[PDB]
């Protein structure tokens, strides 16, 4: 397949996509300082120099300077254009309005012009990959205006964003309730269907699966950069059953306003306990359905499933996943919406995962990703939207965002967007 | 690049800045003459956040110290960094201040003001993105009460869109060093109240309590109790100079720690805090330092936290770290200490980590806590202001100066105010 | 014969679970780290790793981490699969509502986890074998939850465990009568037929058979693991006269309510005593129904005998089988019941019992282990009960267990079941 | 994994702990300055049992020292493990109790219990899984008698589902050390008669015939005694700590020996005890210890067990042992000793083995029993309780501090139901 592009903006964002190019240049055997030495098909994320150089086709972008200093500073200086490192001056400030009207809307113009020129060396373009987080000042006022200007000056293109969806339980933030909903509000219309993954959920991936008693924002990136190597392995590979960008959300999307899938990924094993596990299809196939296993700490048993897009990678054999999967549908603890009969949309490739060096995932032979727009998101958006109108009733922390371009009535017409999408989900999650 | 310019007015604003450009100084490797002679390249790629680069291989701190009388900064220029600071910056008058509001607001700091603030102007324009101002001073001191408030108005007034911080040192309840503290402290307030965007309130008092257990130091001084402040104050600026998982500036928690424009007075704390005795015995990690940070016996507060609730904690760690750890404990706290945060603000921590830790320490950790609790010191400085000018004690030599007793009774309102509106966020909603 | 899974719980099925698989792995020459380096039946008990590594299919569980610890840190750590090392924070302390009510609640998901995942790579489940001391916290307590949740969760299938039965004179605890009861109550109707051993009575043969005079738990636990690899011989070797997990309980159940067989195994002799006896099948079968041989300390000739398996193993011939049985037949101070003219069910098998280096048994190329259910047990039930409704008669020590969630009435019920359980005997040992 | 945190209270209380951390950490193999130097790895897999790990090659016990003069703990101090514990659980007043019960509770001790309760509350929160509480006093002391009640009560109060042992030193019966030992032990029985899972009762005069014939010290003294009581102490939570064929913790002894909740009091032993000229023309095997420990001469209480009846016996092993000789030799004490066993309870023994032993022996025992004979020292203390309170001998001390006279009356009837309680259940049912 052509060409995929990718924007990283934000703290989360940026830090991830230093985690994401780290396995694209080992899976394609580039150095970290752009030159080719250890598949052909790296053109989707690369652009070739014509001297015997790459240059990965990513537009990181930030208000402040310290997290892309590091990246100008690091390893990787070398790789990414020096004019892709687009960079402000003030941070957000974890303010929605500052990252949207005021300093956002100040370098926004510059993002467009590096934007439009990785578009006019492309023979084709399936679409952008966009990673932020969910809430934030910069991953969420600076990701909304993207949105807006990608689908009104492209449209009629794929554009898959990653988001650290606020977890349940811990929150490293304060005002994170009012910034989740206004981005969310602004971003549902102008998305195709935007993964979620909650820091919760990895540490207790980490802490259960992997052997890890000290993880850290390192690790989950480097656990978060085999999701998004294992949804572009089609584009950059081949196998039975590819899967192109755009049937993601063909599949994942029944209806334009429900296009919020979780991930899941399995095998995730220390080195130590892979000796002891044979790892076969159905094994793998049955973790990915398991509440344990899951990136998002909503319960999957909460709900339904509604679609599911398994992206089996290594050596597979096409008749085991048909077996494991026609096991997974007898069961009768797991329950999929009655008007889809169909939900499982397979994908095959023949490349295992890389061996990330230093990190703590063993090697593995056979990998599968599993992507399953599931209701049970929508007890999160509850929670979520509960601690919204808690604050919002006595304007809590409103007065930053009023004076910073933004007008009050934005926070009832976005909790009020997110009361439809409540319905929505509740609407779809039962049949006569 | 973010940057800051750092103003000291008073006896205790300077000698505080003078113990904190020691430590600035020290974590960006900087030698007292101005040369750089740091074992890492890290401390270069933020030095001009604090520093204005003079060519020749030596750096100059962009700070201006301010101070009526000239004894505070003569000291200052005989200490071991006197020469580190721009000659020029060193500006000061003749009359010094009889600890006495008015004069160093109106009569004597009026004169003075215009020329502290071109050199305030200049280090401004010296800079590629002004981010905010810092103000050491203290409310029972007549210098920095009178001529730090009127300095926070006019470099308001001059740039409003810029954040201003204040450590200011507040009267402790039992034992006072002036006499007409409370005058002080109301009229300061009236104007901090509305001028600047967060203050952290110090009282020596609860430093006193802190060397005498928790670091059992037998004889300490304010050589001393500034470092912990110095400490404190460097913590804060951790994430503007030095790179981290989760980078958090001053407006972050302006905005994290700010909920009502009003309610931007904070407590800071500090961790590890042991005494050489004690550090065998005592395990360096992250379950340790977190109940450390929130027990009541580690506030730099006189009022014991657990009399109010906490609207909003910031909680900045340094060195090597674990993020889920953080998170654990944080939740932990959250869970535990159920009562000791409001129902109306469902989370409550703002957690920042940075790489590198302070000096030796392989870890460190800075609090910051917009706590009702302290309703109760503003209360207490409202029944001393009330006793005092209800027969007018010593109100005869600020009247004398120009101030009208007017302005006295609505500072008064205005503080009564500012406690009812502590009071009425410490209710729930259900 | 396919997979039969296997259970440990409580620090004797612990302690005697690293004796039976030093038994397994030296039988198929199983390397302790896990290997084949000396029968390609072993599957029954060990699955296949893929690269050339075999984990046995035993999940050992208790509420203490010393004896677990112990395994963890021996010879076979790397052996067992680690999650299968279930392990708890506190011990049940010897009572039997700790291990059921209390501290047993909270581990007992987990457990089943495994347990479910066990069965999924079951090409064929015959059982499972559970091994746990009759009288004892997380062995009484404990076990009944799994039979109760095995029960109801799979049913349908033989649930075979070992128990040490409290010997009537030596006793190593106090409130052993109250723990035996309580367990025999809720674990009666779950099982299909429970196989009893003392510690007396293992001493006593360990005294006079054998020539040792300083004998421990550890040679109990081998001269226990033969009982165990006999009756699994059918299902991991070949010979005549094959007997399948599921026909003991057939042929050694007349009742539902009667499924409490004894031990015996034949020849137990030092290394220097064999040279003088020539342990022909008559000897050795003539043996088996001595009450100086049996493993538990009832005597055999104070009641009838109903049923019996014979599972002859080693070099046997079957028509010197068929002569020595019409032998025991034929005695008349032998008497078995009226109704049951046919009471004897042979098991021959081709594998001579292995020989454990340092063991105080002695090499035999024919060696024999007998069930019996015999009448004679009801003597014991009856001793058991009385020290039961002597201590409950004071109230010796309910106020622990009804702190520990147990209601009174359970101890009535219990006893009452108990006392219909000697009725039950005593019914079946008349004719008229 | 299963912990436990000790506390020691007044100078027996300290003294014996003293000397019994000088123990615990021989067989863990800690040296005096806190880092490790066994010579097996079999001591660090369960060291956290008592201790908790200080980065830096160092160990340190969490323990809590209780007193209210500081001259029992100075001394600790300045013992060959002084520095081992932690300066903060260091926590002592300055009046000490005139050894009376009621200023050790109500008025000097009630003071200091906050502070107590907080290192408590640190070391049960430095733990992963708490198992239960230690205590170690003296019941004609004031400090252990008053503030040991005040401590238990508190924690069982807070931590009601943990246990809590007591190694409680008891009066002796012939030759006294204070006078008003009698109500200074029936005000602390009334306590740690419902606040106590077990208790283990020790006297002196006891301890002194040990040494006297069965020792055959001529000059023993309390760092002697002391170490008898450590062995048992220790002995009790061998299983805890190490590994062996038939483990048994805290709770499980508690389960098989105590009863009825009130019958909690158990008189402890220790085997072999033989001199130096002895050692030859002994055999150290399982059938000799057995006697031993049954013996009434080798018992740590003044009570004769054959004056009463054994409802529970424990005996807990050490060393490399065969599990048939021990199952025999029980046997044997249960069919020789007929009438010294109840009726209404047939077993009688509950046995424990571990596989390594203590110090350089090759075998050790524990006895632990809970006998009825132990009647007769509590109706010793109620006749001499009686006596003195008959005509209030010494009860305006007691009263001046709080105490109401009421109280006294109604521990001394709690005291006859307990003696009542245990002549009840001496009877047989035919
Ligand atoms: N998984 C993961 N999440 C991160 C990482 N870094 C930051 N985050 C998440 O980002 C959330 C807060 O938004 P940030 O991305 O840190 O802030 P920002 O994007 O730089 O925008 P600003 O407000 O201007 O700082 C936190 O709750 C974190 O969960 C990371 O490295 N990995
Ligand atoms: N034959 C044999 N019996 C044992 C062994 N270990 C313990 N036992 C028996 O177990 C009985 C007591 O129950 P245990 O199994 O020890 O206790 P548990 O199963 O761990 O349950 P808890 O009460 O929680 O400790 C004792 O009377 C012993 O006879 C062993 O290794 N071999
Ligand atoms: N923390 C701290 N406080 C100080 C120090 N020196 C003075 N103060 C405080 O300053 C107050 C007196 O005001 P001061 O600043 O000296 O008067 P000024 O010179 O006119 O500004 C006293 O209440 C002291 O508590 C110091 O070194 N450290
Ligand atoms: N075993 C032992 N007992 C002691 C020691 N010192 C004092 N005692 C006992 O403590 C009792 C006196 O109580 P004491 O604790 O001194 O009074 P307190 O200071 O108020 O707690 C006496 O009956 C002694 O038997 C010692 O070193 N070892
Ligand atoms: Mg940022
Ligand atoms: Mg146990």
Redesign the interface.
């Given at each position: 397949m052509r060409e995929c592009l990718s924007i990283h903006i934000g703290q989360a964002g940026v830090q991830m996509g230093n985690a994401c190019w780290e396995l694209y240049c080992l899976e394609h055997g580039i150095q970290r300082d752009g030159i080719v030495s250890d598949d052909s098909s790296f053109g989707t994320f690369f652009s070739e120099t014509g001297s015997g150089k790459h240059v990965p086709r990513a537009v990181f972008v930030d208000l402040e300077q310290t997290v892309i200093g590091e990246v100008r500073t690091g390893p990787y200086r070398s790789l990414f254009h020096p004019e892709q490192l687009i960079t402000g001056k003030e941070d957000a400030a974890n303010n929605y309005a500052r990252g949207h009207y005021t300093i956002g809307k100040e370098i926004v113009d510059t993002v467009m012009d590096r934007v439009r020129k990785m578009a006019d060396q492309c023979s084709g373009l399936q679409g952008f990959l966009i990673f932020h987080s969910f809430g934030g000042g910069t991953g969420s006022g600076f990701t909304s205006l993207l949105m807006e200007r990608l689908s009104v000056d492209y449209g009629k293109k794929s554009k898959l964003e990653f988001s650290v969806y606020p977890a349940p339980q811990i929150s490293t933030a304060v005002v994170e309730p009012y910034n989740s909903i206004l981005t969310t509000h602004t971003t549902l219309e102008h998305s195709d269907c935007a993964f979620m993954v909650d820091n919760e959920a990895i540490y207790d991936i980490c802490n259960r699966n992997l052997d890890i008693e000290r993880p850290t924002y390192t690790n989950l990136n480097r656990l978060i950069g085999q999701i998004v190597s294992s949804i572009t392995a089609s584009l950059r590979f081949d196998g039975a059953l590819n899967v192109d960008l755009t049937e993601f959300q063909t599949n994942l999307v029944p209806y334009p306003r429900i296009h919020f899938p979780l991930v899941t990924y399995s095998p995730i094993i220390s080195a130590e306990k892979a000796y002891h596990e044979q790892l076969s299809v159905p094994e793998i196939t049955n973790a990915c359905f398991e509440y344990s296993n899951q990136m998002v700490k909503c319960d999957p048993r909460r709900g339904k499933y509604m679609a599911c897009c398994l992206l089996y990678r290594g050596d597979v054999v096409p008749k085991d996943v048909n077996a494991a999967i026609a096991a997974i549908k007898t069961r009768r603890t797991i329950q999929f919406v009655d008007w889809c009969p169909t939900g499982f949309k397979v994908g095959i490739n023949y490349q295992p995962p890389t061996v990330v060096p230093g990190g703590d995932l063993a090697k593995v032979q056979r990998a599968v990703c599993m992507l399953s727009n599931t209701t049970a998101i929508a007890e999160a958006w509850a929670r979520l939207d509960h601690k919204f109108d808690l604050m919002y009733s006595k304007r809590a922390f409103v007065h930053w965002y009023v004076g910073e371009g933004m007008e009050e009535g934005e926070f009832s017409e976005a909790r009020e967007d997110m009361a439809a999408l409540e319905k929505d989900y509740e609407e779809v999650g039962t049949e006569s | 690049?973010?940057e800051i310019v750092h103003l000291q007015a008073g006896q205790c604003g300077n000698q505080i800045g003078a113990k904190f450009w020691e430590v600035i100084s020290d974590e960006h490797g900087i030698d007292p003459t101005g040369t750089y002679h740091g074992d890492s390249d890290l401390q270069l790629?933020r030095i001009n956040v604090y520093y204005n680069e003079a060519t020749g291989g030596k750096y100059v701190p962009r700070a201006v110290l301010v101070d009526l009388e000239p004894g505070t900064m003569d000291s200052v220029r005989s200490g071991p960094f006197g020469q580190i600071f721009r000659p020029d910056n060193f500006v000061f008058g003749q009359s010094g201040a009889g600890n006495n509001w008015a004069k160093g607001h109106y009569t004597e700091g009026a004169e003075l003001v215009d020329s502290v603030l071109d050199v305030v102007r200049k280090e401004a324009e010296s800079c590629?993105?002004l981010?905010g101002f810092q103000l050491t001073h203290s409310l029972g001191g007549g210098t920095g009460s009178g001529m730090g408030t009127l300095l926070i108005s006019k470099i308001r007034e001059e740039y409003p869109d810029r954040i201003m911080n204040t450590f200011s040192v507040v009267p402790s309840p039992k034992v006072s060093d002036t006499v007409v503290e409370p005058y002080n402290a109301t009229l300061s307030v009236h104007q901090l109240v509305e001028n600047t965007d967060e203050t952290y309130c110090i009282d020596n008092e609860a430093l006193y309590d802190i060397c005498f257990r928790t670091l059992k130091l037998t004889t300490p001084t304010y050589g001393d109790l500034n470092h912990l402040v110095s400490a404190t104050m460097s913590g804060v600026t951790t994430?503007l100079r030095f790179?981290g998982?989760?980078?958090a500036?001053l407006?972050?928690l302006?905005?994290?720690?700010?909920?009502?424009?009003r309610l931007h007075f904070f407590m800071p704390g500090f961790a590890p805090l042991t005494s050489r005795?004690?550090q065998?015995?005592?395990?360096?990690?992250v379950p340790e330092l977190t109940?450390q940070m929130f027990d009541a016996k580690n506030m730099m507060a006189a009022c014991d936290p657990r009399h109010g609730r906490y609207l909003?904690v910031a909680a900045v760690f340094r060195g090597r770290?674990?993020?889920?750890?953080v998170?654990e404990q944080?939740?932990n706290v959250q869970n535990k200490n159920s009562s000791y945060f409001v129902?109306?603000?469902?989370?409550?921590?703002?957690?920042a980590v940075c790489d590198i830790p302070p000096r030796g320490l392989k870890m460190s950790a800075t609090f910051i806590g917009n706590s009702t609790a302290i309703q109760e010191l503003f209360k207490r400085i409202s029944e001393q202001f009330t006793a005092m000018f209800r027969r007018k004690a010593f109100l005869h030599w600020y009247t004398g100066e120009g101030m009208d007793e007017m302005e006295f009774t609505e500072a008064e309102s205005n503080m009564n105010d500012l406690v009812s509106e502590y009071q009425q966020?410490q209710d729930a909603?259900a």
């Open positions: - | 690049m973010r790629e590629d993105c981010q994430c790179p998982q989760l980078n500036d407006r972050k302006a905005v994290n720690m700010v909920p009502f424009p005795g004690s065998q015995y005592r395990a360096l990690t109940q909003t770290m674990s993020m889920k750890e998170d944080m939740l129902e109306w603000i469902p989370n409550n921590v703002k957690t966020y909603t």
